[PDB]
Structures are given as C-alpha cells and as structure tokens.
Amino acid sequence: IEQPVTTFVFTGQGSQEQGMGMDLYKTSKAAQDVWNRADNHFKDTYGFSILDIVINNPVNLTIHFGGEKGKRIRENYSAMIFETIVDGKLKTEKIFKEINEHSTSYTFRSEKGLLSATQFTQPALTLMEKA
Amino acid sequence: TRGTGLMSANNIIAEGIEKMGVRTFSQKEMAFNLLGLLTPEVVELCQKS
Amino acid sequence: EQGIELEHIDSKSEFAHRIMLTNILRMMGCVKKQKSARGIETRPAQVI
C-alpha cells in the first residue's frame, strides 16, 4: 500500500549544533557509510576530519603540510581560486593567499566554534541530512 | 668542540690538531652548525630521506 | 665515563648506555605513540 503523497524538504544553514546526527552515526550502518566516506575524503584532500569538527566544536584548527602526503594536501588549498567576473575583464582572486610553496601550516580561526564558520557548517548540515 | 674558554684537558691540544689543516669549534660555532639542520631546506630534506 | 676500559664496564656504563641509547629510542617511541593516538600524520618531529 502506497504511503500518502509525500514531500521531503531539506533545511539550510543556521540550525547547525555540536553533536548533530551523531546519534544516527552510532546506530545506522547507512549513516556510518555517509560520514566515514566523507571524513576519509576530507582527511586526504584537505587535511581535517569533518567528524571531529561536528563532534567537538574546535575553536582553532591548524592543518600541517609536512611529509609527502602533506605537500599534496597543500597543492589542494593552492589550486582553490575564485574566478570572479568583477570589472570588464574577469579577475581570479586565489582563496588562501597565506598559502604558498613555503607554507607548513594554515590555521582556521573562529570566535565561538568552527562548526559556526560557513565552510564547515555547509558540509556538516549537508552530511547530517544525506545520512 | 672546545668545552669552555678555560683549560679542558682536550683544549690545550686543539691548537696542535689545527696545524694538520683541520678545524675545531667553539660551542657557539657548533650551535650555529646544528641550528642549520633546523632551517626549512634541510627540514624539507629530512622528510624525504 | 672516563678511564673505563672494557675490563671496567660496570653499572655506570650500563646506566649511561640507557641514557644515551635505549631511553633515546623509548623517547622517540613515545612521541610516535602520542602523535598516532591523535592521527597526526603530516607534522613530523626532526630527531637531531
């Protein structure tokens, strides 16, 4: 028997909280596969664990670019641009200006917790939901 | 490495070795040498081999 | 340790051998355990 006509609506930013959907992470095989899959992608391309961020709101978070693995992770921040269309001719303002061949660290500052910063909140929501 | 600038049993002969065409070191020089193994080039190198 | 030839290797030399080698290895062993613990794989420690 067909369930009554259903709409799924997915909440955007602002609702984010420490510990969000880590109840499901304990219990659900399907949820575990979503976080674990994404936390391995983050750990290896950008040098942080999105789980750690969600579980314990860290105020500061330093990435280090040491060893061969670490140099690969630094190229992944250096490649991230912002091909803006500002002026008649497009101008490319490279995100993370403080990251060059001779960096060994980059630190994400927040006031309250990193889970309230746009770039961590956006994934933590989008996972919690997808899970 | 010439201990202090006083009479170490090893110090009195430092001058004598140097006549072979060799170098001994003050501790400030041997410090300098080892702080060169913490520069970001030989740190970057240590991390390879 | 001075004036300790091979006939005179005793407790002082056995104890020195622990300061200058086995416990060096145990101190580098330790930092590997505390770094691994916290999944730190990109911030190595130069041992001089």
Contact yes or no for A48/A63 (Cβ under 8 A):
yes
Q: Which residues numbered 3-42 in C keep a CB inside 8 Å of some CB on A? A: 39-42
Beta-strand relationship, A91-92 and A83-84: antiparallel
The answer to whether A73 contacts C43, with C-beta atoms less than 8 Å apart, is no
CA-to-CA distance for A5 and B19, rounded, in angstroms? Answer: 98
CA A86, chain centre distance (Å)? 27
Other beta carbons less than 10 A from residue A35's beta carbon:
23
SS3 C47: coil
In B, which residues are within 8 Å of C46 by CB distance? 37-38, 43, 46
Whether A4 and chain B come into contact, CB under 8 Å, resolves to no
Euclidean distance between CA atoms A104 and C43, whole angstroms = 9
Among B residues 21-40, those touching chain A with beta carbons less than 8 Å apart: 40
CA dihedral A46, A51, A57, A62 (to 10 degrees): -20
User: What are B18's two structure tokens?
Assistant: 């140097």
Beta-ladder partners of C34: none
Nearest chain A residue to B43 by CA distance is A66
Classified as helix, coil or strand, A106 is: strand
On chain C, the residues whose CB falls within 8 A of the CB of B43 are: 46
CA of B16 to nearest chain C CA: how many angstroms apart?
22
Query: Inter-chain contact B34–C46, Cβ cutoff 8 Å?
Result: no
Residue A71: Cβ within 10 Å count: 14
Question: Cα(B1)–Cα(B33) distance, rounded to whole angstroms?
Answer: 12
As given in the structure block, the two tokens for residue A43 are 């750990």
Tell the residue number behind the tokens 């061969």, with chain if given.
A68
- This PDB structure is determined at a resolution in Å of 2.9
Q: How far, in Å, CA of A86 to CA of A92, rounded?
A: 9
Is the CB of residue B31 less than 8 Å away from at least one CB of chain C? no
Strand partners, A61: A108
1-48 of C, contacting B, C-beta below 8 A: 44, 46, 48
CA–CA dist A113, A8 (Å, integer): 30
